[PDB]
Amino acid sequence: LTYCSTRKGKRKTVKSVVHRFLRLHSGLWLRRKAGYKKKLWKKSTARKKRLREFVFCSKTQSKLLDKMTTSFWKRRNWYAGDPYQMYHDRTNLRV
Amino acid sequence: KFVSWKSRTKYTVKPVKMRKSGGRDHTGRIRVHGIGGGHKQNYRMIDFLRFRPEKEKAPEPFEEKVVVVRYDPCRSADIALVAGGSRKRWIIATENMKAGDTILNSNHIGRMAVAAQEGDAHPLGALPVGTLINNVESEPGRGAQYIRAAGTCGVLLRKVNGTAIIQLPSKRQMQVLESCTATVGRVSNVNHNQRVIGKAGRNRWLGKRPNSGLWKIRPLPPMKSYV
Amino acid sequence: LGYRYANNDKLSKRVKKVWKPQLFTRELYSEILDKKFTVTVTMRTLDLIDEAYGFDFYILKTPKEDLGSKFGMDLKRGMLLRLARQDPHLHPENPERRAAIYDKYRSFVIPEAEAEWVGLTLEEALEKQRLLEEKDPVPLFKVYVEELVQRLQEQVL
Amino acid sequence: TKSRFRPPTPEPKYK
Amino acid sequence: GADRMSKWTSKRGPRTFTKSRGAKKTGIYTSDRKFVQIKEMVPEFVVPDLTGFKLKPYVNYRAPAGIDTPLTAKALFQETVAPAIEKDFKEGTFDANNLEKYGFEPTQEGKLFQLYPKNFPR
Amino acid sequence: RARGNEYQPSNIKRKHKHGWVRRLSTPAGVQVILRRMLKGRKSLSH
RNA sequence: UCUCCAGGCAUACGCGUAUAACAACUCGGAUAACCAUUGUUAGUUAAUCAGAAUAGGCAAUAAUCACACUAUAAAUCACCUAUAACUUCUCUGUUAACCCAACACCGGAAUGCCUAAAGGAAAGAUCCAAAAAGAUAAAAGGAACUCGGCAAACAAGAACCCCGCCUGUUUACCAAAAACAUCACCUCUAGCAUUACAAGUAUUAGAGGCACUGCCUGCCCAGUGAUCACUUGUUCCUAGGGACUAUGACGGCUAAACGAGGGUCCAACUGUCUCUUAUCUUUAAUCAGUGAAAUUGACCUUUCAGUGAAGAGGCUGAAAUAUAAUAAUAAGACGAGAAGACCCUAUGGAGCUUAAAUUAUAUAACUUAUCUAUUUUAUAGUAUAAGUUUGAAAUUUCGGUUGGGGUGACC
RNA sequence: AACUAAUCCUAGCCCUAGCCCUACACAAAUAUAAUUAUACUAUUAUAUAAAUCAAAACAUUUAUCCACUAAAAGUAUUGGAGAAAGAAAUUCGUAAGGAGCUAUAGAACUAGUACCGCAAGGGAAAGAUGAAAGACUAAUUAAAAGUAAGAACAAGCAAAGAUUAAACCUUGUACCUUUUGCAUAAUGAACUAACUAGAAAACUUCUAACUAAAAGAAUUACAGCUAGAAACCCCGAAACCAAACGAGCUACCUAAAAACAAUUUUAUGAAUCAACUCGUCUAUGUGGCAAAAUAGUGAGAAGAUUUUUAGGUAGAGGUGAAAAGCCU
Ligand SMILES: [Mg+2]
Ligand SMILES: [Mg+2]
Ligand SMILES: [Mg+2]
Ligand SMILES: [Mg+2]
Ligand SMILES: [Mg+2]
Ligand SMILES: [Mg+2]
Ligand SMILES: [Mg+2]
Ligand SMILES: [Mg+2]
Ligand SMILES: [Mg+2]
Ligand SMILES: [Mg+2]
Ligand SMILES: [Mg+2]
Ligand SMILES: [Mg+2]
Ligand SMILES: [Mg+2]
Ligand SMILES: [Mg+2]
Ligand SMILES: [Mg+2]
Ligand SMILES: [Mg+2]
Ligand SMILES: [Mg+2]
Ligand SMILES: [Mg+2]
Ligand SMILES: [Mg+2]
Ligand SMILES: [Mg+2]
Ligand SMILES: [Mg+2]
Ligand SMILES: [Mg+2]
Ligand SMILES: [Mg+2]
Ligand SMILES: [Mg+2]
Ligand SMILES: [Mg+2]
Ligand SMILES: [Mg+2]
Ligand SMILES: [Mg+2]
Ligand SMILES: [Mg+2]
Ligand SMILES: [Mg+2]
Ligand SMILES: [Mg+2]
Ligand SMILES: [Mg+2]
Ligand SMILES: [Mg+2]
Ligand SMILES: [Mg+2]
Ligand SMILES: [Mg+2]
Ligand SMILES: [Mg+2]
Ligand SMILES: [Mg+2]
Ligand SMILES: [Mg+2]
Ligand SMILES: [Mg+2]
Ligand SMILES: [Mg+2]
Ligand SMILES: [Mg+2]
Ligand SMILES: [Mg+2]
Ligand SMILES: [Mg+2]
Ligand SMILES: [Mg+2]
Ligand SMILES: [Mg+2]
Ligand SMILES: [Mg+2]
Ligand SMILES: [Mg+2]
Ligand SMILES: [Mg+2]
Ligand SMILES: [Mg+2]
Ligand SMILES: [Mg+2]
Secondary structure (H helix, E strand, O other), X not given: OOOOOOOOOOOOOOHHHXXXXXXXXXOOEEEOOOXXXXXXXXXXXXXXXXXXXXXXXXXXXXXXXXXXXXXXXXXXXXXXXXXXXXXXXXXXXXO | OOOOOOOOOOOXXXXXXXXXXXXXXXXXXXXXXXXXXXOOOEEOOEOXXXXXXXXXXXXXXXEEEEXXXXXXXXXXXXXXXXXXOOEEEEEEOEOOOOOOOEEEXXXXXXXXXXXXXXXXXXXXXXXXOOOEEEOEXXXXXXXXOEOOOOOOOEEXXXXXXXXXXXXXXXXXXXXXXXXXXXXEOOEXXXXXXXXXXXXXXXXXXXXXXXXXXXXXXXXXXXXXXOO | OEEEEHHHOOOOOEEEEOOOOOOEEEEEEEOOOOEEEEEEEOHHHHXXXXXXXXXXXXXXXXXXXXXXXXXXXXXXXXXXXXXXXXXXXXXXXXXXXXXXXXXXXXXXXXXXXXXXXXXXXXXXXXXXXXXXXXXXXXXXXXXXXXXXXXXXXXXXX | OOOOOXXXXXXXXXX | OOOOOOOOOOOOOOOOOOOOOOOOOOEEEEOOOEEEEOOOOOOOOOOOOOOOOOOOOOOOOOOOOOOOXXXXXXXXXXXXXXXXXXXXXXXXXXXXXXXXXXXXXXXXXXXXXXXXXXXXXX | OOOOOOOOOXXXXXXXXXXXXXXXXXXXXXXXXXHHXXXXXXXXXX
């Protein structure tokens, strides 16, 4: 990680994260299942069904990605017609 | 810094002082190994263009007198001073050449082959096929560059349509024009090969330094298995 | 002078490479100069000369940078000075021939003073200026004499 | 081994 | 171990190395290693006759010194050449061509003592 | 044998090798002089 | 004046006032006297010693007492033809005990002449201890010493084996040899000029290997008829038909000689030894002057048994015990110093080797193009580009587990 | 009741701000072996920066090294799509001082000097009276280690509890680092003075301003937003690349030179043996006379000999009768 870049003096986003994970404004992260496109001819139908899903990240993994991405990737985005509109907030959670 | 001693523009019989290179290039690095040291030697300028007319003289056959047959330290063969007209020059001496003999330099080309005594330059066309020759030259007027070592001789194999085939000492056959001039006979010091050096110090006199102490085929991919 | 990737893939080694122009030596005739020069010339220049419809047109048209040669710039000054002065040395004893050449290249005519300072480098221009302004110091004797005469003449006036 | 030394300065002390 | 800081002089070096101490040459070395002195190249001291000289090395304290006025080209011109031109101007016998009449030298060439470049020493 | 006496002084050898004229012969030698002038050295060469 | 030692005076290179007198007595000489030290003043005197005009023409015949005498390695401006100038003494080096080695260093330093006529002093005063170093002498014996006759000797003679043919050369500062070179012999490459080779040309030049020398000795040498025909062989045309085919990669070894080579043996010899001693010098010790180094947590620094990590001056249990110096010994202080040794580790290196991976306008080559000549397509070449083929080289790498290793293996 | 010593304040320096420059030093000399008054032989930078290092190796690659502030924005893009790199469009702008040093500090500097290296090059240390020295150079301090004044007195990590009493009596296995959380180990320290090593605000906590809004332009927001405070060391390789500098040592070569007595063979890389060259053996030395010597003993000594002078070959290299030997 570049903690202080020469030209600007700012932290730099890791683009390996931007191309694999989606952050919801609450703080959750979405990911795919590794191998969901690999050797599908020998996987069971139930196995394939699990792979197609989108999965969440843990507290540690979420903490890591928040260190490898900059605040710009942690803002509110008002996209019209967004298919993730309802998932950016947590409701009826006491904890 | 390194200026070759070969700076004399004008021919002269007087011996010219030499400088040896020890094998080093003009940059000071060795380009040939084993060369260094030896007795101080004086260069005696040799004329290999036998038929050279004297200044303001007609280009016709002329004779010259063999004054002396000296020993040249810069060559295997022994040179002979030849005096004719009003000039003196050094020439390579034939095996049987003796002082006081007269040799013939003849540019004239004869249609009919004429027997030639040893040492008389004649055009290759003039020489009958099979005569022993030396000091042969590739092109007329180029001086001699072949068969000029002690005891060497060349054979005039074939003269056809103004072209002559000469069997060089290495047995290589080289074709030249019949206009080329080569004197008859083998070069002197025939017994050069028979000498025995005997002592290592003798070669060190000649300038030959000691050698160093440092002590294939690719099989094709199919042939790797069998080896 | 650059680098290339062996086999044209960036995962291979980086190898030094120099690309050279296929220089050619040819003979060219300048109408304005009426002289034939032998010059090392690339095939690109030959096409440019053809597109310029003549060697003389090529030199005059091409700017200083595109030309990319000090020898060419000298030719530019020589041709420009020839046209600027209408020198009779061009094809002497044949005025008809001389007029044709000058008229054909009349478009490039420029003032004589400007033409002189064409293609010169800073050092050559500096040397040219220094020579022009070089003068031996005036004797003070004369300078005082001029002042004295003027004062005396004014007083008499 | 190494080696370095210092000078015996004249040091005139007459003030 | 050679002393770099001492001056390079002829006392140092081998026999072959030699150089002058600044003495002006007075002759020529001809062929065969023979020196031929030239009388003209030997300076000659022009010494005046001091008989009847009224000036001594030291000056009296009582004598009062004057105001220092470094001589200038203009001052010399006014003293020497200006009066001649001024009188000539009134008479009208003056022209630019004959400035030499008042002492002007067009070129220093031909003068025994050339003003510039100086061909005579102190 | 006994080392330590490598220096065999010869003024002709010294001046040819590290002299003024020798240094000025090459630009690489002239840049040796140029740096020495920058530092302030008492002697620029032999 | 006496005693004794035996490289000295110049020159060159170098050094740069260390020269000489006076005056000082801080510093330098490793201590004194005295100065080589400090300050001041001086100094080395050259027409002979030493250092620093032009254009042509043309040289076959060494040296060595050069005569004889031979040899081989083949060997040091002058004199002429013409032009130009017609009577000069300046400049610089010159001293010393000296230079290269941090030093007033038992070292290094070229030439000429000479070998004492020149140049010098091993002992500051003492004292006679051990140990150590050097010299000389030995009753009887004579290598019985020892890894070995190392060293020493009133000896310095003789033969042998091995290895290299010989003279020679090499790791400056641990190996001088059997290793390298070497003559002779053998193999490979090259048919040629104006900077090595070489101003040379196959009896030559480069590259590399190997002791040579007579003698045994490799294979290789179509088959049968007999200089002749067939059978083969090799090619084509289709199993036929034509066409064509007239001792050298190896040993013994000469065989002698020569060796500061590696081993032996005899003889003499001897303090090597049985068996050590005596005298002398040096060193030591004492008086005087001068004055280092490694080392050092602190130390008021004991013995024995026990315990402990092959381990105890210091802990545990007994014991011993006025304080300090001087000179000796080397048992301990896992005594002090060194870039020494050993096994293992590092996603630490660097040298070499290529059958490692990746490249590779070093070279050479060829192909298509560009391009200039040419002939109606054509064969030439090529200040270039794109390929293909070699590789002189460059870059980078050394998986893990198997009580070490090669082989098996295993992950 | 004091020796060694200690105290000291200004010499200069550091970072900014302003500012292009027009400091190019009588006369004489210097590119010849610089600083030598005159002719000879004439005089001229460079093809692409590499590598280290990072990628926990390394082979593509690796910010600075190598064109106005702030914002867009660490965004689009680029990348063994890894480490990492990283725009623009378009907006915005009229721009003399010290919470620095004060002689181991600040520059290396009293000086690029002394000294060291053949050269390139490397590189110091230190001073201190007063208004007056034309007032006999002051002061000032039980003050560092070290000594002296004043050696020691059975017994022991040197002390502690003590005691009438300094020592006797009792108790007590140096310190740090380090090993397992153990040392009678193993490292490091003779002692004194001075110097000598944790640094950044993405997330969090704490404290305030305003509050569906906060912020002095671009930012964030379903109680947020703004500001404050709060954080992540030192010393040390073998190496690698670039460019200079070195063949006065040494390997080799070129040129110009020099030395070799006597004796016997003969007519010589033959013999005996000095000068001279070398360096087999033993002994001494071992911070030595010596960073390779001395005493003896040995090898060659007309030759492939030794020596002198000047020049040439330079590190991807040179040289090598090959020891991976030499090249200060
Ligand atoms: Mg061999
Ligand atoms: Mg790279
Ligand atoms: Mg040295
Ligand atoms: Mg020497
Ligand atoms: Mg004296
Ligand atoms: Mg005296
Ligand atoms: Mg001494
Ligand atoms: Mg004195
Ligand atoms: Mg003389
Ligand atoms: Mg003298
Ligand atoms: Mg004495
Ligand atoms: Mg004594
Ligand atoms: Mg005896
Ligand atoms: Mg005895
Ligand atoms: Mg025995
Ligand atoms: Mg012996
Ligand atoms: Mg031998
Ligand atoms: Mg030998
Ligand atoms: Mg050795
Ligand atoms: Mg030897
Ligand atoms: Mg030895
Ligand atoms: Mg031997
Ligand atoms: Mg016996
Ligand atoms: Mg003692
Ligand atoms: Mg004493
Ligand atoms: Mg005590
Ligand atoms: Mg005690
Ligand atoms: Mg004990
Ligand atoms: Mg015990
Ligand atoms: Mg005890
Ligand atoms: Mg002991
Ligand atoms: Mg590497
Ligand atoms: Mg890395
Ligand atoms: Mg590695
Ligand atoms: Mg300082
Ligand atoms: Mg400093
Ligand atoms: Mg004290
Ligand atoms: Mg007690
Ligand atoms: Mg210690
Ligand atoms: Mg570090
Ligand atoms: Mg030399
Ligand atoms: Mg050698
Ligand atoms: Mg003799
Ligand atoms: Mg030797
Ligand atoms: Mg002998
Ligand atoms: Mg012998
Ligand atoms: Mg001999
Ligand atoms: Mg070897
Ligand atoms: Mg060295």
